[PDB]
Amino acid sequence: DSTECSNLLLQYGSFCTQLNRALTGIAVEQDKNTQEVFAQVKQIYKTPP
Amino acid sequence: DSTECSNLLLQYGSFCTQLNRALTGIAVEQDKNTQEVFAQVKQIYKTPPIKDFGGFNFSQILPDPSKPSKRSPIEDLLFNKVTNGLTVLPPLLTDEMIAQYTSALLAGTITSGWTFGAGP
Amino acid sequence: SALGKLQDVVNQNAQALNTLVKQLSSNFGAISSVLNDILARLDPPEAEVQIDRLITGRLQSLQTYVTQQLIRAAEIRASANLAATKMSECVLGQSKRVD
Amino acid sequence: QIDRLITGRLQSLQTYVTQQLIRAAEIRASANLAATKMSECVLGQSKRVD
Amino acid sequence: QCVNLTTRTQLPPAYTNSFTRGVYYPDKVFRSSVLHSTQDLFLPFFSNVTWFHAIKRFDNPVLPFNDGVYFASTEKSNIIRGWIFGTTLDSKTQSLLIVNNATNVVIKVCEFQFCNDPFLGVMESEFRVYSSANNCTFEYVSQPFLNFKNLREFVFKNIDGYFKIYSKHTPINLVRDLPQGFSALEPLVDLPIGINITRFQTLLALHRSGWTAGAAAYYVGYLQPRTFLLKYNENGTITDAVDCALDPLSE
Amino acid sequence: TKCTLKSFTVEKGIYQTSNFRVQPTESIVRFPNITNLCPFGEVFNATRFASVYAWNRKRISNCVADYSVLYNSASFSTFKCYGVSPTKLNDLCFTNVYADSFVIRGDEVRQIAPGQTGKIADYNYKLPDDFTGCVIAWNSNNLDSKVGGNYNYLYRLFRKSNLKPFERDISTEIYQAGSTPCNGVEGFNCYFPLQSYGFQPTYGVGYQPYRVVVLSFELLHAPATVCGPKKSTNLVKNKCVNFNFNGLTGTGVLTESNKKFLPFQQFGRDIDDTTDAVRDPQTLEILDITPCSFGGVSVITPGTNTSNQVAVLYQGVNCTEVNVFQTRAGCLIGAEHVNNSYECDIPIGAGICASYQSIIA
Amino acid sequence: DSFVIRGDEVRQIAPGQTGKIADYNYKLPDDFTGCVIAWNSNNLDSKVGGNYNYLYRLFRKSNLKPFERDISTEIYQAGSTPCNGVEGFNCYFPLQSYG
Numbered sequence A: 001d002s003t004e005c006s007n008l009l010l011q012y013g014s015f016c017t018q019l020n021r022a023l024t025g026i027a028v029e030q031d032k033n034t035q036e037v038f039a040q041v042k043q044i045y046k047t048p049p
Numbered sequence B: 001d002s003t004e005c006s007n008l009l010l011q012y013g014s015f016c017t018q019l020n021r022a023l024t025g026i027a028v029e030q031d032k033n034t035q036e037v038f039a040q041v042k043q044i045y046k047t048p049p050i051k052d053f054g055g056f057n058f059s060q061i062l063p064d065p066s067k068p069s070k071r072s073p074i075e076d077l078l079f080n081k082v083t084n085g086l087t088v089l090p091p092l093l094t095d096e097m098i099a100q101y102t103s104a105l106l107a108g109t110i111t112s113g114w115t116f117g118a119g120p
Numbered sequence C: 001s002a003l004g005k006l007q008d009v010v011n012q013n014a015q016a017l018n019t020l021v022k023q024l025s026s027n028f029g030a031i032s033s034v035l036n037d038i039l040a041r042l043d044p045p046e047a048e049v050q051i052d053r054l055i056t057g058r059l060q061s062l063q064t065y066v067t068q069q070l071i072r073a074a075e076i077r078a079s080a081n082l083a084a085t086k087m088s089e090c091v092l093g094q095s096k097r098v099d
Numbered sequence D: 001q002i003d004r005l006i007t008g009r010l011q012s013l014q015t016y017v018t019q020q021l022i023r024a025a026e027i028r029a030s031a032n033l034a035a036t037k038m039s040e041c042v043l044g045q046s047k048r049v050d
Numbered sequence E: 001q002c003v004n005l006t007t008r009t010q011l012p013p014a015y016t017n018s019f020t021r022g023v024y025y026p027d028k029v030f031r032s033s034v035l036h037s038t039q040d041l042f043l044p045f046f047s048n049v050t051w052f053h054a055i056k057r058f059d060n061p062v063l064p065f066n067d068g069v070y071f072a073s074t075e076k077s078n079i080i081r082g083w084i085f086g087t088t089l090d091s092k093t094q095s096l097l098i099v100n101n102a103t104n105v106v107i108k109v110c111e112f113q114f115c116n117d118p119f120l121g122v123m124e125s126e127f128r129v130y131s132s133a134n135n136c137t138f139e140y141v142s143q144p145f146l147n148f149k150n151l152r153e154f155v156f157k158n159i160d161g162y163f164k165i166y167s168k169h170t171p172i173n174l175v176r177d178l179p180q181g182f183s184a185l186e187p188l189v190d191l192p193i194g195i196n197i198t199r200f201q202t203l204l205a206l207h208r209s210g211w212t213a214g215a216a217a218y219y220v221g222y223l224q225p226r227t228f229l230l231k232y233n234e235n236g237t238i239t240d241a242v243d244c245a246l247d248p249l250s251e
Numbered sequence F: 001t002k003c004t005l006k007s008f009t010v011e012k013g014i015y016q017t018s019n020f021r022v023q024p025t026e027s028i029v030r031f032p033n034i035t036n037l038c039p040f041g042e043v044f045n046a047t048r049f050a051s052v053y054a055w056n057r058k059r060i061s062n063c064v065a066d067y068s069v070l071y072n073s074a075s076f077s078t079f080k081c082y083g084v085s086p087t088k089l090n091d092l093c094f095t096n097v098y099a100d101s102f103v104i105r106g107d108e109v110r111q112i113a114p115g116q117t118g119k120i121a122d123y124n125y126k127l128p129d130d131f132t133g134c135v136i137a138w139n140s141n142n143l144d145s146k147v148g149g150n151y152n153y154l155y156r157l158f159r160k161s162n163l164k165p166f167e168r169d170i171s172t173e174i175y176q177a178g179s180t181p182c183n184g185v186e187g188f189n190c191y192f193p194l195q196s197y198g199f200q201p202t203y204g205v206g207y208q209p210y211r212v213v214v215l216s217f218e219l220l221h222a223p224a225t226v227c228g229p230k231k232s233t234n235l236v237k238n239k240c241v242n243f244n245f246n247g248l249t250g251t252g253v254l255t256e257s258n259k260k261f262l263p264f265q266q267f268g269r270d271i272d273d274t275t276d277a278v279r280d281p282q283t284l285e286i287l288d289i290t291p292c293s294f295g296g297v298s299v300i301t302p303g304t305n306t307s308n309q310v311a312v313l314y315q316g317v318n319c320t321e322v323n324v325f326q327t328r329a330g331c332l333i334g335a336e337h338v339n340n341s342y343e344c345d346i347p348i349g350a351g352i353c354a355s356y357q358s359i360i361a
Numbered sequence G: 001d002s003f004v005i006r007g008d009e010v011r012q013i014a015p016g017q018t019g020k021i022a023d024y025n026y027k028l029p030d031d032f033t034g035c036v037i038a039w040n041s042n043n044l045d046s047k048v049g050g051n052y053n054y055l056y057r058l059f060r061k062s063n064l065k066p067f068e069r070d071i072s073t074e075i076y077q078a079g080s081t082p083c084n085g086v087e088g089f090n091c092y093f094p095l096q097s098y099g
């Protein structure tokens, strides 16, 4: 929460934006992986009683 | 162009060589990727002038003679719908040759079935 | 959004280059992001320190760019290998593999 | 002086480990492909073209 | 010479909406067909700006400068002529004077003795804004900048001892309030003053035929540190802007 | 290629070995018109100078000062600086300059110095020990001196305490030489402090009147309005030169531009915030700054077992800026272009390949 | 390297210092290794009438290189006018003695 640290960190540019973008890409990639593996049918089939 | 900066940069060693070599490896890898995907035939096949395929129409996927780029209408639509020390190297295969490779693959799969992929 | 995968690759490459270029405007804790201004405003004993700060910041930026480019290159290589497999098995023959 | 040497050598080692991991991923993908070829081409007859 | 004005009518100050006004060019750099994100002292979109009238209304108070001043003027017949800039507004400190008389604009940084009620008068034959001028450090004479027919936008900033004056002239035909639209303010003049300024006061002109105040209205807005996304067209003018801290859509 | 690969044998292929740079040929510095000059004509060459007890202080600010004309003038008998260099006055910038003008005796010219004790130093004009600026003095026997004696120039002879730096004293209080009470009435030991000089044309060197102007520099937090003169050179286009436009420096090729700037805009930037357009300060015209033709130098060779012939590829470089053939990949030197098509042996790029049969492309 | 300087000038005999004798009399490199030794010599290197045997280069066109010695007793041209080896207006001897 140090404002002086953030002011000094802004001198280094868009490193933080790059890291956040990479982590966001990984986070959406995991959901895409689950969607690709398990959601291969658009109908919910049910077994007979 | 600063000579003092280069003199100070020499203290860090061969970092620049590693960055250049990694980028060169990526650049040759892209050409290898294109070569693996499209250059799967060593014969350039062409379709017959008469498009009598028993009612099957391939005009949207065969190359258009009217266009200077020799692309299909679908390929033309696809190309239209895609929009300090830095250099961009051109790809080894131009768009015309990639279109020519796709044309050869289409001509082979239309006129010869799967036989051209396994031999003559 | 039909051609989103190619547009994503083009956008990622352009954005990566853009981020690299924009890293030159950052001083990385030095008095200025311009080497000429440091060389003209200070003597070489302190200009050496400021230039060293700029060098390490720009080198870190370039290493970051090369690393992410290598990771994206691995992803594109996997996609291209898949595309070559589809070219061999779907176009040059009939595939019994489901989906 | 030792601090300057440590930061330079540590950056070099981290860079080397990073490309080693990327090459390890590439070799792992090639090895997975080789295992697939061993299972499907040697231990059976494959209908997959090329 | 100073004269107390004792014929004013008491009325509370008004307030209105800034809409999408107050945008200026952050630098002297041409940009073509590109979107630029900049962090600077900007006026917030749709903000609450103080509205003052001259109609018996004669609104000439002294207000804190803060980090910058956006001055909007719905003006006809050129009643508003200049501004008073300083900290204590007396001979103890050094103050900045901006005046536009009948011939030219004069910018002076001197030790002036300001009147409690400074004004001009209209043929212009009445100047009652100061009584003395002792120590002048900077003088600059320039070309004149100038139903309500004229809209004058000004931005005043004190950054690193530089006084930036941005201005725009707009032809409007709205009767009472600020029109809704987009107009980017061009940079007009940068002043090397290097002095502390914390308070300001508008300078008006009397009409003599006691005294009568000509019909004019002005608006005061305050500059805050924020980010704007500016759109540059093919010809290089700013045609649209986005306030990054206004609403989540613009964010 | 052998040097780069750290081997004496090179396998067939293309190897990126160097980086071609278009070396800058000229330096082009364009700065705007040298107008609004500082009024040094009315200080050094005024009609009437002031006395030393009431030296005239002129403030030089908000102008560009040409110190070369002042320094190169041969009329000045003394040009001594105590905080700066005479040859660097045209390069440095200062917030403001204080010009102290007075007339003194020829023997007292040395007394305007830091650390110097004299009547003028203690009672008329005092300088600090860490004084910065320059003292200029010249003989003025032809103008100030009168055959009847010039008594206009007065000087303070007595004061109880020494002066502080940059302090004036125009008071006419009667000095007390002894301890007797004096209420402004002159007596045996009470004299008027200001005495008149005896400037006459018959005196030799040392008693002639010397006009002294002392320039003091201030380097406070105020902006540096006072700067040295700017020597703008001619503008050269269509070549890779080092440009310095209004303090913005770089290296590039300056070509004509079709971009119409608005009158307040000076530089031009692309998407990546790099300066690609600029306005010349001398003449209001727009110039495009194309970066110089930097490129990668790649060497195309077969195996050293087969042959030692090589070809050079300059990537992304036109052939007019370096068996020369122009490709979209770059300029290829050392390969003969043929119209026949063969299989790709060594990849060049943009559909161009090289092979050995001599080296053909 | 042995020499005699003032009391306040002992800080300028160091790597990376800005000064007068640093530029025109004795320059040390930025990567200098070794030791600087200074000791007071008022008892030996001073005289009641003034010891003027120690001289320094007041005027030079440019700063010296590291480990460079200038013993040339040529006149210095401080102005536009050439001096032709003779002292005069804006023509001063480069070597001045300490009092």
Ligand SMILES: *[C@@H]1O[C@H](CO)[C@@H](O[C@@H]2O[C@H](CO)[C@@H](O)[C@H](O)[C@H]2NC(C)=O)[C@H](O)[C@H]1NC(C)=O
Pocket (backbone or CB within 6 Å): B051, B057, B058, B059
């Ligand atoms: C194959 O398909 C194409 C396109 O669907 C047909 O071309 C169309 O022909 C009709 C009548 O000649 C025209 O009205 C359309 O404008 C044509 N469309 C295009 C895109 O050219 C073509 O006739 C079909 N048959 C053959 C044998 O090519």
Ligand SMILES: *[C@@H]1O[C@H](CO)[C@@H](O[C@@H]2O[C@H](CO)[C@@H](O)[C@H](O)[C@H]2NC(C)=O)[C@H](O)[C@H]1NC(C)=O
Pocket (backbone or CB within 6 Å): E002, E003, E004, E116, E117
């Ligand atoms: C106009 O009114 C103001 C407000 O009272 C006057 O300012 C005061 O003048 C008296 C005169 O001696 C001073 O003692 C006060 O200190 C002033 N007030 C402040 C806040 O400084 C002003 O003088 C009036 N103008 C004229 C011409 O009388």
Ligand SMILES: *[C@@H]1O[C@H](CO)[C@@H](O)[C@H](O)[C@H]1NC(C)=O
Pocket (backbone or CB within 6 Å): E015, E016, E017, E048
């Ligand atoms: C502006 O401020 C005034 C008083 O400060 C208030 O009455 C008014 O509602 C405000 N306007 C807006 C739009 O917030």
Ligand SMILES: *[C@@H]1O[C@H](CO)[C@@H](O)[C@H](O)[C@H]1NC(C)=O
Pocket (backbone or CB within 6 Å): E087, E088, E196, E197, E198
């Ligand atoms: C400017 O003036 C205000 C009040 O007039 C004071 O509080 C502030 O400290 C001043 N700032 C500087 C930098 O002098």
Ligand SMILES: *[C@@H]1O[C@H](CO)[C@@H](O)[C@H](O)[C@H]1NC(C)=O
Pocket (backbone or CB within 6 Å): E101, E102, E103, E104, E106
């Ligand atoms: C306008 O102000 C300037 C500056 O004091 C003055 O010289 C000029 O005469 C003024 N013009 C009129 C019409 O009063």
Ligand SMILES: *[C@@H]1O[C@H](CO)[C@@H](O)[C@H](O)[C@H]1NC(C)=O
Pocket (backbone or CB within 6 Å): E111, E134, E135
């Ligand atoms: C300011 O003015 C007063 C009187 O007008 C004078 O005594 C003082 O010296 C002046 N100061 C400066 C810095 O000019």
Ligand SMILES: *[C@@H]1O[C@H](CO)[C@@H](O)[C@H](O)[C@H]1NC(C)=O
Pocket (backbone or CB within 6 Å): E233, E234, E235
């Ligand atoms: C840009 O300028 C041209 C004149 O060269 C004009 O025709 C065009 O309408 C302008 N476009 C905009 C968006 O202002």
Ligand SMILES: *[C@@H]1O[C@H](CO)[C@@H](O)[C@H](O)[C@H]1NC(C)=O
Pocket (backbone or CB within 6 Å): F040, F041, F042, F044, F045
């Ligand atoms: C008087 O001095 C000024 C100083 O700038 C100089 O420009 C001018 O030429 C001088 N005049 C004569 C007649 O020497």
Ligand SMILES: *[C@@H]1O[C@H](CO)[C@@H](O)[C@H](O)[C@H]1NC(C)=O
Pocket (backbone or CB within 6 Å): F033, F281, F282, F283, F284
């Ligand atoms: C500056 O000098 C040039 C000399 O060619 C002249 O053409 C120009 O009008 C002058 N003024 C400006 C504002 O450029």
